[PDB]
């Protein structure tokens, strides 16, 4: 006869990589701006002074 | 009155090449690849390790 693995021998192997859901992030980051005219407007001055 | 060869003296010539047939491979290998983007996703950590 012909030799076979055991049932419970039969190795299965794990891949440490793993793969990710694509997002749609909007595309809002090209209006941003510190501009006048800025679709979006930025306003980064509470991270130097004080306030909420 | 007219000589003409022998019936097994007429001489018949052989090509030693050969015609293959077509065959559509479907375009399925450009894109096979291993990058995140790719449509058809190859892996190679069975031909190191053991399992099927």
Do not use: C, R
Request: net charge negative; no cysteine; glycine share 10%.
């Amino acid at each position: 006869a012909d030799t076979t693995p055991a049932t419970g021998l039969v190795v299965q192997q794990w891949e440490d990589k793993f793969f990710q859901e694509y997002l749609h992030d909007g595309g809002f980051k090209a209006l941003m701006g510190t501009d006048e005219n800025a679709v979006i407007q930025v306003k980064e001055d509470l991270s130097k002074k004080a306030g909420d």
